[PDB]
Amino acid sequence: RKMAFPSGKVEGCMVQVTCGTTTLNGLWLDDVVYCPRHVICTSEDMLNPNYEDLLIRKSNHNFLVQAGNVQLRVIGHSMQNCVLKLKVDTANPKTPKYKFVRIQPGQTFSVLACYNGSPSGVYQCAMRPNFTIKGSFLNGSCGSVGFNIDYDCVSFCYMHHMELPTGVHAGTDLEGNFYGPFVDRQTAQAAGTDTTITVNVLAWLYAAVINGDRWFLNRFTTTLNDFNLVAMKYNYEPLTQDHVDILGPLSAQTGIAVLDMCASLKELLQNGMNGRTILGSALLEDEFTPFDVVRQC
Amino acid sequence: FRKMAFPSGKVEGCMVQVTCGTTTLNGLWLDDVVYCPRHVICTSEDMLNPNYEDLLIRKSNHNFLVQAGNVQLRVIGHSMQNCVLKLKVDTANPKTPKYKFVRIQPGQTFSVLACYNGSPSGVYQCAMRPNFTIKGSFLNGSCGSVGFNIDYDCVSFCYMHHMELPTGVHAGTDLEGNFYGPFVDRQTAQAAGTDTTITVNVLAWLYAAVINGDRWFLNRFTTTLNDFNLVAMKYNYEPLTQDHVDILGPLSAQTGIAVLDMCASLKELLQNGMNGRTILGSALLEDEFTPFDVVRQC
């Protein structure tokens, strides 16, 4: 089962941010609220916004920040890349221990989808190799954040800014730097060609085994380089030696050598599933990391 | 589409741990009552067929250890409601949300906050199968984890976890302690009925495909509900109820496609197969999204 981190620590930080006729979500940590800077745009602005220009023309009192029924007074504002930072006069007592991180493609994270400052749903995503994320984000979701929880610490890794015409999504880290070649303007943008996260497919196959599913296994083996040749042919990421290392615990747990699973994946790529499913799916799933699988088994 | 859970924070604020001896499971702390599975009072010698009523008479308030984190909550009364233990505690939970206890129907979905020793580990979306099992992720120590939906500010609690079956699926009760399905809280091998496909959710999925402009499978014909139900059962699909017909109303309205017309389209897919075609990027029909789930993500 695809499993998200419990979202309570993040729900206590979500607020609503309005400028003009534009409302989206912000993240309130300590006495600062972080949100996408395109909240300051209007219809005409959005096509080619000169954000520094638009921002200097704004006053602190142009920002309406609401935490539920309560309006927070903005006592200062600044911009860090694509993220607007609003200083408010009061600190959030619900602020958890946190940090800002930039995740690598193939890493997963939970998304708390929010609208008008209110949490609506939580789900698990992966950072695609082409730096998109396949999410459920509608109008008004901008400022929703993605995160992981290690111990009692929330690592914020994603803030949501836009949809692409293919229906995937793009956004920034909490320093305001986009993942991928995207820009926060109202244009149709295309991503690089997406590739499949191989180490995650391998983790998922080990999971199907742990759960007693093994029809796809074979007795064949393969070298790492010969597997990577076939992987790349089918637009799968090559498997690094650290990726192999990371798969050790699942290998140990099932007694299936990593390169043996690679030989099984190779057969699937070349032949398909021929009606058969794995863990219920007709497709090879690649949004489960080794850690995600282990933690759940 | 994707499975999307409700935000879990209102439920996290209610999770505690309940311990008898060395046996620790999770409980749900609402106002001044903690709810947990009664088998917290079982020993290993008792697991195969406990006498819960006799096991409880031997129990006093001061034998129950209830903790929120490392903070003890003193128990001041206890009772048993079916398969659930109710422990009155001396502190009202300040984080109690608006809530209700609901008993859901097969096919309905809900979020599960998987907890261990009172600490949440993850949240995910489950479907109650037509045979009253759920396909969860539960390890040892997960009992007492709850399933819920959130409507506005109000948490509807619908599931409490009690056990695993040989097939690897899971079974449990509502918050009044009544099992879903024919199962009992004893350490015995129990078999669920044969699982069937959740027809109402497949229909919801077809509506979702139509809303997104994927509508090759729509035909010019209709059927009666009885005719559809009789065919459906031959393909191991659940028959539709009047409540199923009714909760498809909004999607029927959104699309202008009568429920019974969508049933005729489904019938043709069941009889003729997909013919190497996809619906929403899939050769498989999905049955774990309810009409409400579809509306949420659309």
Ligand SMILES: *[C@H](O)[C@H](C[C@@H]1CC=NC1=O)NC(=O)[C@H](CC(C)C)NC(=O)OCc1ccccc1F
């Ligand atoms: C903020 O809430 C919003 C979220 C997206 C709206 C619908 N699904 C979403 O994920 N963000 C925006 O609307 C973006 C604002 C820009 C100034 C960055 N724009 C956007 O998502 O639309 C992209 C676009 C533009 C033109 C043609 C196609 C297309 F996809």
